[PDB]
Design an enzyme around this catalytic site. Structure first.
Site, PDB file in Angstrom:
ATOM      1  N   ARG A  37      31.630 -31.029  89.915  1.00 58.88           N
ATOM      2  CA  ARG A  37      31.654 -30.106  88.781  1.00 58.88           C
ATOM      3  C   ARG A  37      31.728 -30.779  87.410  1.00 58.88           C
ATOM      4  NH1 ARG A  37      33.122 -24.695  89.627  1.00 58.88           N
ATOM      5  NH2 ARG A  37      32.715 -24.516  87.376  1.00 58.88           N
ATOM      6  N   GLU A  96      39.770 -12.391 116.400  1.00 59.53           N
ATOM      7  CA  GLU A  96      39.064 -11.992 117.613  1.00 59.53           C
ATOM      8  C   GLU A  96      38.836 -13.156 118.577  1.00 59.53           C
ATOM      9  OE1 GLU A  96      35.535  -9.552 116.971  1.00 59.53           O
ATOM     10  OE2 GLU A  96      36.737  -8.122 115.827  1.00 59.53           O
ATOM     11  N   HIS A 116      33.751  -7.190 117.025  1.00 60.27           N
ATOM     12  CA  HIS A 116      32.688  -7.719 116.165  1.00 60.27           C
ATOM     13  C   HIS A 116      31.853  -8.857 116.758  1.00 60.27           C
ATOM     14  CE1 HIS A 116      35.411  -5.586 113.393  1.00 60.27           C
ATOM     15  NE2 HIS A 116      34.319  -5.337 112.692  1.00 60.27           N
ATOM     16  N   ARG A 175      32.982 -20.612  86.714  1.00 58.29           N
ATOM     17  CA  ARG A 175      31.576 -20.773  86.364  1.00 58.29           C
ATOM     18  C   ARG A 175      31.221 -19.768  85.271  1.00 58.29           C
ATOM     19  NH1 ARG A 175      30.904 -22.766  91.937  1.00 58.29           N
ATOM     20  NH2 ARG A 175      29.466 -24.552  91.857  1.00 58.29           N
TER      21      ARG A 175
HETATM   22  O1  LIG Z   1      30.986 -25.491  94.166  1.00 56.03           O
HETATM   23  C1  LIG Z   1      31.125 -25.077  95.319  1.00 56.03           C
HETATM   24  N1  LIG Z   1      32.094 -24.077  95.559  1.00 56.03           N
HETATM   25  C2  LIG Z   1      32.274 -23.571  96.862  1.00 56.03           C
HETATM   26  O2  LIG Z   1      33.099 -22.660  97.019  1.00 56.03           O
HETATM   27  N2  LIG Z   1      31.481 -24.079  97.933  1.00 56.03           N
HETATM   28  C3  LIG Z   1      31.613 -23.620  99.245  1.00 56.03           C
HETATM   29  O3  LIG Z   1      30.533 -22.862  99.837  1.00 56.03           O
HETATM   30  C4  LIG Z   1      30.622 -21.469  99.486  1.00 56.03           C
HETATM   31  C5  LIG Z   1      29.247 -20.825  99.716  1.00 56.03           C
HETATM   32  O4  LIG Z   1      28.246 -21.573  99.028  1.00 56.03           O
HETATM   33  C6  LIG Z   1      30.520 -25.085  97.666  1.00 56.03           C
HETATM   34  C7  LIG Z   1      30.326 -25.586  96.367  1.00 56.03           C
HETATM   35 SE1  LIG Z   1      29.029 -26.749  96.099  1.00 56.03          SE
HETATM   36  C8  LIG Z   1      27.647 -25.802  95.591  1.00 56.03           C
HETATM   37  C9  LIG Z   1      27.121 -25.864  94.274  1.00 56.03           C
HETATM   38  C10 LIG Z   1      26.014 -25.053  93.898  1.00 56.03           C
HETATM   39  C11 LIG Z   1      25.438 -24.181  94.861  1.00 56.03           C
HETATM   40  C12 LIG Z   1      25.948 -24.105  96.182  1.00 56.03           C
HETATM   41  C13 LIG Z   1      27.059 -24.926  96.540  1.00 56.03           C
HETATM   42  O1  LIG Z   2      38.308   1.206 110.909  1.00 58.12           O
HETATM   43  C1  LIG Z   2      37.405   0.728 110.223  1.00 58.12           C
HETATM   44  N1  LIG Z   2      37.756  -0.119 109.147  1.00 58.12           N
HETATM   45  C2  LIG Z   2      36.745  -0.716 108.367  1.00 58.12           C
HETATM   46  O2  LIG Z   2      37.086  -1.475 107.450  1.00 58.12           O
HETATM   47  N2  LIG Z   2      35.375  -0.457 108.670  1.00 58.12           N
HETATM   48  C3  LIG Z   2      34.329  -1.019 107.943  1.00 58.12           C
HETATM   49  O3  LIG Z   2      33.529  -2.059 108.554  1.00 58.12           O
HETATM   50  C4  LIG Z   2      34.242  -3.311 108.593  1.00 58.12           C
HETATM   51  C5  LIG Z   2      33.520  -4.243 109.577  1.00 58.12           C
HETATM   52  O4  LIG Z   2      33.394  -3.599 110.844  1.00 58.12           O
HETATM   53  C6  LIG Z   2      35.052   0.394 109.751  1.00 58.12           C
HETATM   54  C7  LIG Z   2      36.052   0.989 110.536  1.00 58.12           C
HETATM   55 SE1  LIG Z   2      35.562   1.963 111.916  1.00 58.12          SE
HETATM   56  C8  LIG Z   2      35.634   0.898 113.309  1.00 58.12           C
HETATM   57  C9  LIG Z   2      36.598   1.052 114.340  1.00 58.12           C
HETATM   58  C10 LIG Z   2      36.651   0.137 115.429  1.00 58.12           C
HETATM   59  C11 LIG Z   2      35.720  -0.936 115.477  1.00 58.12           C
HETATM   60  C12 LIG Z   2      34.746  -1.103 114.460  1.00 58.12           C
HETATM   61  C13 LIG Z   2      34.709  -0.176 113.377  1.00 58.12           C
END
Ligand SMILES: O=c1[nH]c(=O)n(COCCO)cc1[Se]c1ccccc1
Ligand SMILES: O=c1[nH]c(=O)n(COCCO)cc1[Se]c1ccccc1
Ligand SMILES: O=c1[nH]c(=O)n(COCCO)cc1[Se]c1ccccc1
Ligand SMILES: O=c1[nH]c(=O)n(COCCO)cc1[Se]c1ccccc1
Ligand SMILES: O=c1[nH]c(=O)n(COCCO)cc1[Se]c1ccccc1
Ligand SMILES: O=c1[nH]c(=O)n(COCCO)cc1[Se]c1ccccc1
Ligand SMILES: [K+]
Ligand SMILES: [K+]
Ligand SMILES: [K+]
Lengths: 251, 253, 250, 250, 251, 250
Positions: free
Chosen positions: D220, D77, D5, D165
């Site tokens: 929060r 990885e 990946h 939420r």
């Molecule tokens: O409340 C939160 N929960 C989470 O799991 N967090 C981590 O980032 C996750 C992806 O935004 C970050 C926050 Se803060 C926040 C509030 C409103 C909109 C974006 C982030």
């Molecule tokens: O075996 C798999 N399992 C999965 O969960 N899949 C979905 O995409 C997941 C992110 O690549 C895709 C495959 Se096919 C594959 C084999 C080797 C390397 C990349 C994808």
């Protein structure tokens, strides 16, 4: 001077005994032994205090488990290694049904598994059930001394406080899983709370060992919280008399 | 004034003399040993598996109180000490190591525990980490370096049983329930250091209730090397660990 | 009818508080016939009900069908009609080598390998039999002179995979039940049947008395095919035990 | 490409053993710019990787994306390529009133409200951070001068119902997570994020070192919508800590 | 006389049949078989009544399961042993959505697993999903005869009372797990309650057997509880016509 | 922006009710180019959104990223914007020997090996696809002429241990997933992927319509490393199906 890891006992110390009375309290061991003929102290290590006594001309062991499944599991296992096949627990208890009074004696047919140690012997679906002969002898022994007896299901908890839904604590909170739990158990006809029966009954029933469970009601949770100092001793003596008399029937 | 403020310990808050730190061994016979390392040791109470001594550390009162084996009694000891005003708990114990590189006589500081117990669930659901307090962990690791020891820091498997939960087969039944069959090998592969019986309960119940908790243990057996501990190395290892827990208590006052 | 499935009213029971509850609807007449004044009451789906008289007291016989779900319906509706004591008579396959075909088993409590018991109490609650009912059955078995074993029963929602049978269409057993019979055997579990976990759980958690007895028609450690002569003999042998136990609980 | 990946080879790392792992792929360039000699290696899917130098030693910055699944891909990885130490830099929503917006939090261990962690170790295993990594993050926070809290983090597999939420499309939260925020609050849980449970479990169960730090951009217990200026300041503040902590661990 | 343990049937009895209509009520068996050609009684043992008939020149089986997953699991397994590969369930149901009326027909895509028997074939995470070709045939058959049809998820319970959150019972209580469960299912778009689909769909989908599920609504839980007897038989007749028509398309 | 993560307004959608949701953000342009008027809307984190027109009706294409957590964010925020129909197009690894590379798989329902689905419905709730969506996908697959298999999919929260891959850093698989692939294979499960369980559960429990289609680029029973050119044409084959299916649902 020991055949086991914790108890500090040899097979010879038992003198051929196959039955053990197993209280939670090490300080109660002498009291139970004193009810039988020629009692002698064998060992005392950690929370495991062991006495040997004679009942109807036959050796009987009294050994403390300590509070809870973990130390119970150690004591029962090591006693089993030493030759014990029948285990009779004598406990204290808090009743959760309004019809059960302080001074009453409770015989447990099976336990609600609110512990961890029972799972180390059998999956949750396996019943923490008491041996039929042991339960019978405890019921017969209760009538022998003339006590008020209730027979049924016990809730066996790994904690004294939150698992028994006590709120009189440092935190004042009970985890979601146990919030409203006492009311649930009450509605299901569960008589009481204690802390060792689930482990004891499960580990014995799943390993070919006979186990019985009896307890004196110290407090009823629907009327009081703090026990009386004098009634505590009288109730303990009553149930101790029953567990010795039950052992007589199982020799 | 009083006789007992709690249900089991047989202690009043007045007995503690303002102490906020407790050292909590499993063995009631270890209490005097720990208290003898500090100033003015006095026996306070002995009831069931709970033996309590009070001592002085750098002018500050400290409690030593045994929990007994396992989570259930540990939960009673910790709760009732918290009722009496203890905010910091340091457990000193014995342990069997399961990693080949950890030798007998080594000292293990637990960051967090695998929850193979039942009592921890009575405070927090399984998803909640049985994690030690960072300041307590820091103090124990620093104390171990101070007096000099072979130290390993990491994860401990905390079991509700000594026998099947730690995959011992030399038993009456000689069997281990399906759930725990092959379990030691799995913990080994996951880098788990050792087995003991109280840490999951202690660490969970403190971390989920605003209390500080630390966990230290001397290894007296290595499961890949032996089963029966040596009745001399046992004494020296305990002495080693007892010196470390008192020194860590010094840093936390 | 006072109930949704049984097709019975309170008057039909004539003050009965005890029911014998077999799985097979065809067994209902057989049990009733051993008692006085046996009368058919109703038959709807797998629920066949008869009323009889034991020592001048009215007793109900009612089939549950196979499994916890239909058992739960039968027990609930009988309870609504006034039944307080439930005695299950069943057939079983033994899993211990020492138990013989023709032996009778009294269940103290059950391993809950069912779903319906969970609808009454969480898994940690024991599927335990009532002490008086168990005593009655043990004493009734001792009176007629049968070979009796007392202990734990594995109660399965399924006849095949949950009892680790491999002689099936798929020939596979799900991971959870793979090696399970061996585990139960080591734990001292006597036998497999299909209703006791539900019955015992729902009764013990609702203030109802329940007992469980079964005749061994197969031992899984020797042979699978039951004999078409011992089957009738063992059934009638265990039917006599449950009726005699009912006599002690009136 | 030696991996499935990330699109990186063992040679691309140039002997790197430490990696800083943000969630946001737009943060990779920000973190690498603060170190000496930043070089873009690869960008595939949600995984963007940059190579930098810290105190004359190669350090990798690689985005995990939101949640455990891609975090599990990224960490695994990178481990195959030689990374032995993982430091997570993220944003968080605090649930304690004494923790303010702008504060920095170091995670000792995490509440496992995720699925991926179970794919490495059973639930009973603690999602615990490496002691040396935690030490470095706390010491780095003290170095730059910031209000720091050390404790437990709730790591959710979801942003909305798992963090309780209700301002959503359905406006409902599943029974399991109903009232859960108050539960974590009483248990002293500092905050909510979405990656730590997976990262910490998978590293601690595989001999890999992992550390977790986050900047509070929302609280929060006061306001839901964050400020479009204080967010960037807090993010930049937390980055300085993770780079300083990386210096102590090399 | 019999190749199977319970049904009392041989392979020859089936005459090469690969499809079976499986009602819960043993009394529904003759009624279903009567809608087809050359109806013949095969066996009746316990709750298992079996009839054989013909559909467009092809032999088809009608076999009762009884109430619940346990007896269903026996019937389906033993029918599979005798050569059945396609299973179509027709049943009764209580709807939990306000927009679904009494007399409506419901086709189940997949089921909420509130049963025990499904776990004996696949872990809980495995979907209790119906076969695509079977579901298609049922939906098409329902539109062909002209009925009000709803397609979606069904809650499949090992219990008629507490697991369907009925409080009109002896105890009048519902265990914590199922307390407020109906409201949860309602908000999740679950159409109805019945007692066999989770077991049937799970055991078939995990064993390479085709299964479909159809039911006639005789009660709406948000409205009345007491159903009309005349309406019940008419609703059954509607659903029986659909399942036979769907079987035509699957031969 | 009316949403927290996607950076989109209700007006940006132009009244679109349907959205095609791939995992890979680089595939968003590819699907949008198949339809009339491809327009880029926003690109934040792993979420890239493109608007297009199908049969004179607006259609959204939005990347979910890998795994349930970011999928749950994307689907929830799209539902807030007005999307009611979600059609997933992905890649997959087949576990059945009869399914070849290049085949197309339509998912009726998913084995829930994820954590995010639990945040919407308990495990017993089936991760089932919408019947109309599934019908449209099957019909679209037959329309363009593709080798199609319809059935159950295992949806894992991880790429490696949850799909029982041993070619890893540790080389170990946790007990829970040890021998799991064989179990799914015997149960007739077609394939592995990483999003469907979350998507299908969260939609089926919220009144939203969801469909799942995937292209087989590898088969686990034969080899691990797929062909480069075959991977491109299989993606194009699946993309053609999901667009054709979208035409039927508008
Ligand atoms: O409340 C939160 N929960 C989470 O799991 N967090 C981590 O980032 C996750 C992806 O935004 C970050 C926050 Se803060 C926040 C509030 C409103 C909109 C974006 C982030
Ligand atoms: O075996 C798999 N399992 C999965 O969960 N899949 C979905 O995409 C997941 C992110 O690549 C895709 C495959 Se096919 C594959 C084999 C080797 C390397 C990349 C994808
Ligand atoms: O309520 C109880 N719960 C129990 O688990 N129990 C058994 O002994 C546990 C250790 O005391 C005994 C009682 Se009774 C009692 C009430 C208050 C103080 C001590 C004992
Ligand atoms: O293997 C162990 N597991 C443990 O849980 N442990 C802690 O003390 C428990 C009570 O002895 C101590 C040891 Se070490 C030991 C091995 C054999 C006999 C005594 C102690
Ligand atoms: O092994 C068994 N398991 C059971 O659950 N059982 C109880 O009756 C269930 C319905 O037949 C009865 C037996 Se015995 C038997 C063996 C072969 C064929 C029928 C019955
Ligand atoms: O509410 C229901 N739940 C069900 O599981 N069901 C299926 O039949 C099961 C045996 O009656 C049927 C109904 Se409808 C009904 C209501 C009251 C009395 C009988 C049937
Ligand atoms: K103890
Ligand atoms: K992601
Ligand atoms: K039945």
């Amino acid at each position: 001077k020991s055949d086991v890891f914790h108890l500090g006992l040899t097979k010879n110390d038992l003198q051929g005994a196959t039955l053990a009375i197993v209280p939670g309290d090490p300080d109660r061991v002498e009291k139970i032994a004193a009810l039988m003929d020629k009692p002698v102290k064998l060992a005392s290590h950690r929370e495991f205090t062991t006495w040997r006594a004679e009942l109807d001309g036959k050796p009987v062991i009294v050994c403390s488990t300590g509070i809870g499944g973990p130390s119970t599991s150690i004591a029962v296992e090591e006693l089993a290694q030493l030759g014990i096949r029948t285990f009779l627990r004598i406990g204290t208890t808090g009743a959760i049904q309004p019809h059960i009074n302080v001074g009453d004696v409770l015989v447990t047919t099976a336990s609600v598994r609110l512990d961890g140690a029972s799972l180390h012997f059998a999956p949750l679906e396996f019943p923490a059930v008491a041996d039929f002969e042991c339960t019978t002898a405890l019921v017969e022994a209760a009538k022998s001394i003339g006590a008020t007896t209730h027979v049924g299901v016990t809730a066996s908890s790994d904690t004294f406080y939150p698992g028994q839904e006590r709120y009189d604590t440092y935190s004042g909170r009970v985890v979601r899983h146990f919030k409203g739990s006492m009311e649930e158990w009450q509605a299901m006809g569960v008589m009481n709370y204690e802390m060792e029966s689930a482990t004891l009954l499960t580990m014995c029933a799943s390993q070919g060992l006979r186990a019985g469970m009896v307890a004196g009601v110290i407090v009823n949770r629907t009327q009081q919280e703090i026990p009386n100092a004098e009634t505590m001793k009288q109730t303990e003596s009553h149930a101790v008399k029953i567990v010795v008399e039950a052992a007589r029937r199982l020799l």
